[PDB]
XYZ file of C-alpha atoms in Angstrom:
503
model
C 1.548 -36.106 -3.926
C 3.948 -32.900 -3.604
C 3.747 -29.176 -4.633
C 6.380 -30.046 -7.476
C 4.388 -32.737 -8.756
C 1.609 -30.328 -9.472
C 3.824 -27.636 -10.848
C 5.535 -29.786 -13.106
C 1.912 -31.015 -13.897
C 0.120 -27.796 -14.935
C 3.369 -25.875 -15.623
C 2.418 -23.133 -13.574
C 3.718 -22.253 -10.146
C 1.199 -19.978 -8.318
C 2.957 -17.338 -5.394
C 0.881 -15.726 -2.864
C 1.793 -12.504 -1.429
C 0.815 -9.436 0.661
C -0.528 -6.341 -0.601
C 0.742 -4.136 1.681
C 3.439 -5.558 4.001
C 5.740 -2.728 3.455
C 8.591 -3.702 2.750
C 8.655 -7.358 2.758
C 5.400 -7.726 -0.110
C 3.725 -4.481 -1.292
C 3.206 -2.758 -4.338
C 5.652 -0.039 -5.603
C 4.857 2.608 -7.723
C 3.988 0.493 -10.873
C 1.801 -1.965 -8.721
C 4.559 -4.551 -9.183
C 4.946 -6.711 -5.940
C 8.310 -5.999 -4.786
C 9.774 -6.681 -1.290
C 12.624 -8.210 1.015
C 10.321 -11.117 1.244
C 9.379 -11.151 -2.455
C 13.067 -11.477 -3.515
C 13.185 -14.831 -1.733
C 9.945 -15.854 -4.002
C 11.728 -14.934 -7.135
C 14.954 -16.888 -6.021
C 12.761 -20.036 -4.885
C 10.546 -19.310 -8.407
C 14.029 -19.928 -10.184
C 15.052 -23.028 -7.996
C 11.924 -24.798 -9.093
C 12.730 -24.072 -12.847
C 15.999 -25.787 -12.066
C 14.733 -28.590 -10.259
C 11.952 -29.591 -12.583
C 13.895 -28.473 -15.654
C 10.930 -26.208 -17.062
C 12.571 -23.166 -18.118
C 8.822 -21.955 -19.669
C 7.307 -22.531 -16.189
C 4.233 -19.810 -15.775
C 4.398 -17.660 -12.923
C 0.994 -16.470 -11.603
C 0.599 -14.376 -8.555
C -2.507 -14.300 -6.017
C -3.128 -11.439 -3.373
C -3.358 -13.069 0.015
C -4.493 -11.754 3.443
C -4.339 -13.303 6.783
C -8.029 -14.441 6.644
C -7.449 -16.412 3.382
C -3.680 -17.327 3.649
C -4.292 -20.872 4.990
C -7.455 -21.793 3.545
C -6.091 -21.397 -0.304
C -2.878 -22.634 0.482
C -4.651 -25.529 1.754
C -6.963 -26.192 -1.258
C -4.047 -25.896 -4.197
C -5.155 -22.262 -5.303
C -1.542 -21.049 -4.707
C 1.714 -22.725 -3.905
C 3.528 -20.597 -1.577
C 4.046 -17.100 0.259
C 6.701 -15.038 1.205
C 5.804 -12.025 3.427
C 5.912 -11.510 7.288
C 4.000 -14.687 8.695
C 4.889 -15.540 11.892
C 6.161 -19.215 12.737
C 4.181 -20.930 15.553
C 3.250 -24.117 16.627
C -0.445 -23.592 15.887
C 0.041 -22.627 12.556
C 2.195 -25.652 11.963
C -0.766 -27.866 12.395
C -2.184 -26.045 9.281
C 0.695 -25.667 7.057
C 4.507 -25.741 7.100
C 7.317 -22.661 7.339
C 10.518 -22.811 5.354
C 13.697 -21.566 6.885
C 13.520 -17.980 8.636
C 13.950 -15.041 6.774
C 13.413 -12.428 9.400
C 14.024 -12.638 13.308
C 12.055 -9.719 15.354
C 11.714 -8.437 18.845
C 8.609 -7.096 20.416
C 9.611 -3.743 21.651
C 7.821 -0.437 22.572
C 7.460 2.577 19.760
C 7.396 6.003 21.880
C 7.796 10.053 21.803
C 11.222 11.031 22.339
C 10.648 13.614 24.962
C 8.910 11.033 27.427
C 9.390 9.013 30.301
C 8.981 5.274 28.570
C 12.422 3.785 28.807
C 11.844 0.499 29.299
C 8.596 -2.121 29.993
C 8.417 -1.145 33.774
C 7.496 2.547 32.826
C 4.461 1.434 31.388
C 2.539 1.433 35.088
C -0.722 3.338 35.442
C -0.308 4.037 31.499
C -2.045 3.822 28.338
C -0.428 1.266 25.884
C -1.836 0.208 22.378
C -1.621 -3.214 20.748
C -2.409 -4.358 17.497
C -5.134 -7.007 18.318
C -4.532 -10.740 17.821
C -0.769 -10.245 17.526
C 1.674 -11.758 20.204
C 2.534 -8.585 21.530
C -1.114 -8.757 22.877
C -0.435 -11.743 24.747
C 2.775 -10.564 25.920
C 1.399 -7.155 26.933
C -1.402 -8.529 29.292
C 0.724 -11.467 30.488
C 2.641 -8.548 32.061
C -0.093 -6.507 33.158
C -1.495 -9.362 34.997
C 1.859 -10.552 36.585
C 2.980 -7.662 37.623
C -0.044 -5.716 38.692
C 0.714 -2.995 36.383
C -2.618 -1.300 36.175
C -2.180 -0.653 32.598
C -4.896 0.383 30.192
C -4.326 -1.358 27.316
C -6.092 -0.649 24.072
C -6.319 -3.157 20.954
C -6.405 -1.668 17.627
C -7.676 -2.989 14.372
C -4.309 -3.088 12.764
C -0.549 -1.453 13.064
C -1.696 2.029 11.270
C -4.571 2.374 13.781
C -2.202 1.400 16.601
C 0.147 4.075 15.719
C -2.062 6.332 15.014
C -3.317 6.020 18.391
C 0.258 6.521 19.669
C 0.476 9.379 17.150
C -2.313 11.198 18.598
C -1.093 11.016 22.160
C -4.207 8.452 23.250
C -1.495 6.281 24.078
C 2.241 6.552 25.697
C 3.632 3.584 23.897
C 3.028 1.046 20.936
C 4.128 -2.322 21.578
C 4.723 -4.883 18.539
C 7.469 -6.532 16.506
C 10.192 -4.255 16.328
C 10.234 -4.209 12.723
C 6.855 -3.333 12.370
C 7.137 -0.050 14.638
C 9.824 0.900 12.297
C 7.576 0.737 9.608
C 4.874 2.507 11.153
C 7.405 5.193 12.128
C 8.639 5.723 8.500
C 5.070 6.573 7.641
C 4.905 9.278 10.207
C 3.765 12.851 10.031
C 7.150 13.618 11.792
C 9.070 10.051 12.439
C 11.892 11.861 13.704
C 9.762 12.254 16.823
C 9.643 8.433 17.514
C 11.558 5.772 19.239
C 12.129 2.088 19.952
C 12.604 1.284 23.558
C 12.195 -1.694 25.768
C 13.921 -4.616 25.993
C 12.542 -7.596 24.028
C 9.574 -9.677 25.218
C 10.095 -12.065 22.879
C 11.732 -13.385 19.566
C 9.627 -13.942 16.472
C 10.433 -15.580 13.335
C 8.818 -14.668 9.838
C 8.797 -17.530 7.509
C 7.651 -18.408 4.169
C 4.785 -20.441 4.391
C 3.678 -23.969 2.213
C 1.408 -27.021 2.352
C 2.077 -29.298 5.380
C 3.599 -32.552 4.858
C 5.664 -31.548 1.706
C 8.966 -32.318 2.532
C 10.304 -31.952 -1.301
C 9.125 -28.652 -1.693
C 9.981 -27.376 1.858
C 13.836 -28.973 1.315
C 14.017 -26.686 -2.254
C 12.793 -23.613 -0.274
C 15.042 -24.440 2.871
C 17.824 -24.731 0.382
C 17.317 -21.683 -1.555
C 17.093 -19.708 1.409
C 20.006 -20.997 3.252
C 22.196 -20.336 -0.122
C 21.197 -16.794 -0.201
C 21.469 -16.135 3.867
C 25.033 -17.918 3.878
C 26.587 -16.483 0.585
C 25.697 -12.857 1.758
C 23.059 -12.278 -0.739
C 20.391 -11.538 2.277
C 22.303 -9.090 3.899
C 22.404 -6.913 0.271
C 18.543 -7.434 0.406
C 18.123 -6.051 3.865
C 20.130 -2.826 3.071
C 18.299 -2.279 -0.235
C 14.518 -2.350 1.513
C 15.490 -1.508 5.064
C 18.506 0.977 5.352
C 17.703 2.852 1.897
C 14.643 4.449 0.360
C 11.739 2.918 -1.015
C 8.632 3.808 -3.079
C 5.483 3.235 -1.805
C 1.804 3.420 -3.677
C -0.794 5.765 -2.180
C -4.027 4.284 -1.192
C -7.729 5.621 -1.753
C -9.897 3.834 0.587
C -13.599 3.527 -1.187
C -16.568 2.991 0.719
C -20.332 2.229 -0.488
C -23.058 4.813 -0.138
C -26.253 3.482 -0.735
C -28.395 6.538 0.065
C -26.950 8.157 -3.255
C -26.653 4.552 -5.241
C -22.551 5.582 -5.156
C -19.689 5.939 -3.552
C -17.473 7.566 -1.250
C -13.745 8.223 -0.942
C -11.260 9.343 1.733
C -7.346 9.874 1.694
C -4.477 12.038 2.383
C -2.102 13.257 -0.354
C 1.368 14.901 0.972
C 2.797 17.148 -1.197
C 6.537 17.678 -0.664
C 7.733 21.332 -0.211
C 11.080 22.439 -1.581
C 12.380 23.299 1.763
C 11.690 19.839 3.096
C 8.416 19.867 4.514
C 5.106 18.308 3.466
C 1.788 20.437 2.432
C -0.963 17.909 3.502
C -4.095 17.659 1.173
C -7.257 16.311 2.896
C -9.401 14.632 -0.011
C -13.429 13.862 0.824
C -14.935 12.406 -2.272
C -18.351 11.372 -3.417
C -19.179 9.770 -6.692
C -22.986 9.968 -8.013
C -24.284 7.856 -11.027
C -25.548 10.147 -13.930
C -27.611 7.441 -15.507
C -30.769 5.650 -14.086
C -29.580 2.124 -14.647
C -28.220 -0.253 -12.237
C -24.361 0.493 -11.072
C -22.392 -1.979 -8.786
C -22.115 -1.364 -4.883
C -18.837 -2.244 -3.732
C -17.778 -3.306 -0.094
C -14.824 -1.907 1.746
C -11.915 -1.670 -0.514
C -8.856 0.355 -1.603
C -7.082 1.254 -4.623
C -3.299 1.580 -4.876
C -2.297 4.393 -7.318
C 0.941 6.235 -7.997
C 1.749 8.626 -10.688
C 4.985 9.575 -12.405
C 5.255 13.393 -13.428
C 7.426 14.622 -15.728
C 7.877 16.663 -18.585
C 7.769 17.399 -22.566
C 11.258 18.696 -23.259
C 10.084 20.039 -26.309
C 6.800 22.118 -24.966
C 7.248 25.563 -24.508
C 3.506 25.869 -22.749
C 2.934 25.160 -19.119
C 2.259 21.153 -19.179
C 2.368 18.030 -17.191
C 3.117 14.573 -18.272
C 1.618 12.167 -16.356
C 1.672 8.243 -16.051
C -0.444 6.420 -13.595
C -0.716 2.593 -12.270
C -3.574 1.946 -10.276
C -4.835 -1.370 -9.236
C -7.789 -2.350 -6.918
C -7.271 -4.490 -3.462
C -8.716 -4.829 0.001
C -11.163 -7.522 -0.609
C -10.651 -11.185 0.585
C -10.498 -13.978 -2.109
C -12.655 -16.679 -1.460
C -14.511 -15.255 1.368
C -16.533 -12.586 -0.381
C -20.535 -13.428 -1.532
C -21.735 -5.024 -15.640
C -22.171 -3.567 -19.042
C -19.712 -0.797 -18.719
C -16.811 -3.520 -17.916
C -16.731 -4.679 -21.555
C -16.033 -0.516 -22.566
C -12.741 -0.716 -21.256
C -11.415 -4.240 -22.519
C -9.250 -2.432 -24.725
C -7.198 0.923 -25.040
C -9.667 4.026 -24.507
C -9.051 7.406 -25.489
C -9.217 10.182 -23.097
C -10.160 13.929 -22.831
C -9.870 16.143 -19.958
C -10.813 19.590 -19.630
C -10.542 21.498 -16.546
C -11.996 25.069 -15.529
C -10.379 26.318 -12.629
C -10.890 29.318 -10.222
C -8.384 29.791 -7.428
C -8.561 33.044 -5.562
C -9.973 34.900 -8.923
C -7.048 33.781 -10.691
C -8.829 31.957 -13.563
C -7.246 29.207 -15.646
C -8.120 26.046 -18.180
C -6.220 22.879 -18.410
C -6.697 20.622 -21.297
C -5.456 17.035 -21.404
C -4.932 14.234 -24.129
C -3.955 10.121 -23.554
C -5.140 6.764 -23.246
C -6.337 4.275 -20.880
C -5.597 0.625 -20.158
C -7.856 -0.345 -17.437
C -6.797 -4.351 -18.473
C -3.321 -3.209 -17.322
C -4.345 -0.366 -14.933
C -2.399 2.175 -16.859
C -2.720 5.759 -17.900
C -0.592 8.207 -19.695
C -1.570 11.484 -20.326
C -0.020 15.152 -21.395
C -2.035 18.296 -19.872
C -1.609 21.717 -20.728
C -2.603 25.034 -19.341
C -4.445 26.748 -22.631
C -4.806 30.205 -20.280
C -0.957 30.860 -20.211
C 0.810 29.750 -16.907
C -0.854 27.986 -14.031
C -1.631 30.026 -10.917
C -1.156 26.709 -8.945
C 1.236 24.118 -8.654
C 0.541 20.901 -11.148
C 0.879 18.296 -8.428
C -2.074 19.807 -6.717
C -4.594 18.864 -9.655
C -3.124 15.471 -10.183
C -6.188 13.752 -8.367
C -8.697 16.116 -9.656
C -7.683 15.609 -13.230
C -10.626 9.266 -13.829
C -10.814 6.428 -11.538
C -12.530 3.866 -14.302
C -9.056 2.823 -15.668
C -7.862 1.174 -12.462
C -6.918 -2.772 -13.015
C -9.772 -4.570 -10.892
C -8.604 -7.995 -10.715
C -10.663 -11.030 -11.680
C -11.990 -11.618 -8.088
C -12.864 -7.996 -7.322
C -15.035 -7.092 -10.391
C -18.008 -7.120 -8.682
C -17.138 -3.812 -6.545
C -16.177 -1.816 -9.795
C -18.489 1.148 -9.666
C -16.775 3.347 -11.915
C -17.007 1.107 -15.061
C -20.656 -0.056 -14.070
C -21.649 3.649 -14.268
C -20.458 3.787 -17.917
C -21.522 4.775 -20.677
C -23.869 7.072 -18.731
C -20.964 7.992 -16.318
C -20.950 9.408 -12.765
C -20.439 12.746 -11.287
C -17.429 13.066 -9.060
C -17.728 16.051 -6.228
C -14.207 16.377 -4.089
C -13.349 19.102 -1.044
C -9.384 19.036 -1.064
C -8.517 20.862 2.121
C -4.795 21.983 1.971
C -3.505 22.020 5.702
C -2.946 25.830 6.874
C -4.035 26.932 3.187
C -7.268 27.121 1.438
C -9.712 24.681 -0.515
C -10.408 23.329 -3.565
C -13.884 22.561 -4.658
C -14.398 20.058 -7.387
C -17.413 18.637 -9.392
C -16.567 16.638 -12.460
C -18.566 14.718 -14.760
C -17.049 11.637 -16.006
C -18.602 10.175 -18.824
C -18.547 8.562 -22.527
C -18.674 11.092 -25.526
C -18.670 8.540 -28.546
C -15.557 6.124 -27.960
C -13.675 8.965 -26.067
C -13.787 9.168 -22.042
C -14.141 12.599 -20.887
C -13.756 14.398 -17.829
C -15.032 17.804 -17.563
C -14.098 19.427 -14.413
C -15.405 22.716 -12.443
C -12.708 23.603 -9.835
C -13.387 26.602 -7.352
C -10.577 27.392 -4.786
C -10.915 30.003 -2.140
C -9.281 31.505 0.865
C -5.941 30.380 -0.200
C -2.720 32.121 0.655
C -0.581 34.310 -1.804
C 2.556 33.676 -0.114
C 1.341 30.050 0.581
C 2.525 26.883 -0.993
C 0.240 26.966 -3.405
C -0.251 30.012 -4.836
C 3.443 30.846 -4.081
C 4.460 27.958 -6.095
C 6.619 26.317 -3.303
C 5.726 22.461 -4.115
C 8.257 20.269 -5.905
C 7.277 18.740 -9.245
C 7.034 15.261 -8.141
C 4.001 12.641 -6.805
C 5.635 10.252 -4.061
C 7.342 10.248 -0.599
C 10.083 8.034 -0.117
C 10.182 6.020 2.806
C 13.073 4.737 4.787
C 12.783 2.190 7.779
C 16.395 3.212 9.170
C 16.304 -0.231 10.552
C 19.767 -1.649 11.106
C 20.845 -5.306 10.921
C 20.590 -7.038 14.330
C 22.747 -9.358 15.848
C 20.249 -12.329 15.578
C 19.706 -11.224 11.731
C 23.400 -11.810 11.583
C 23.450 -15.241 13.535
C 20.410 -16.211 11.532
C 22.120 -15.801 8.121
C 25.259 -17.323 9.519
C 22.713 -20.822 10.852
C 19.889 -20.794 8.729
C 17.249 -22.750 10.248
C 13.450 -23.019 10.537
C 12.479 -22.798 14.274
C 9.767 -20.880 15.913
C 10.416 -18.479 18.740
């Protein structure tokens, strides 16, 4: 048959999407799947509705990784994906690729004051690469052919590879140039990094679909070709690759079978009013309060973003917070509670915090609602002791992760809801770089119908003239990213003449 036959039969089109392929397919500030490649997916979805003449077609999404994107495509769990999947002949034995939507070149990322100008300069030096990529093959081929005596480091992913370069453990990072810029956009100081070298190869990114389906491929190729030749694709490029984009935070969770709980590690980069960044290092552990059984999860992360605003009719020191959380990082298809039912509806929230920072005592109270079904939070906090001695953004992470939306395939990894209604104890250590430290102990539990979060906070060794006690932090909670990636001549030529050839 054909994918269009199955779509018209079931009345649904299932779209596969990456979870953290910035800026091709990723979660934005509201946990919505956006990106340059996701713009092609929307156009393809609209073209399917017109081809089949079914304007009421349902559109459902599914998160995919490089692990399960081919098996789940082959058994029909989803119909197509538009992200950064590279077109090659090996994958063409397993599936099909649409017209190319992005062309890259394998180059080098290096520090701006070094000696790395081209690939020949890598001789006798340590070069980092991401395992499994074509760059690892090309870099090894160049090392063996030219006898370069290179110490090649193969890291787990691109973030690991860049942090190898950022820390100085390698002199250059070789990968597709657009992914080098993506890792540069998330750097401590993106201004320090430079893309150099002549491309060792060209790689083509294409939307993937099932093999031996010319009907569905023709529709995707026709939709992609029209978007590119008409100039709509260049406008998408400038919006995503030459303009600021909003990205979610990631809270990585690991199990802790010793204490029947979990641990968490993440960093928050508070913006300073002078343009600099105040780093906040979060170390977290959660222990169940009751003796019953709780869910112990595999390694996964929470995609979180919070919007900070002000009540214009509130005279007290306050913070209005909207939060959007989703769980991610667990491969659907390759993965072997009572409190979950307590969050099926909208749950009232009460937050009470007693704080002590360098002797400055204060208290904060918060009300609102939690929607775990949609992974949504809305809360208004008020400093009941008068003025807040610390900036409001420093207290955001301290002031109820049981309201995160765990998708249906991840529900067995939800420790937070599983510890309810007895709840859990949340202890944190927040190390502000070149400043003081927060020490937090919180009890999160159900008091009646209300989710309650009582916190005791102690802050020590803070500079009275620092970014915290001096109120030098901006009233926001995001770090806008800019790829600063120009439209290459290959991308211009591709938009003029769309094709689906592997490179």
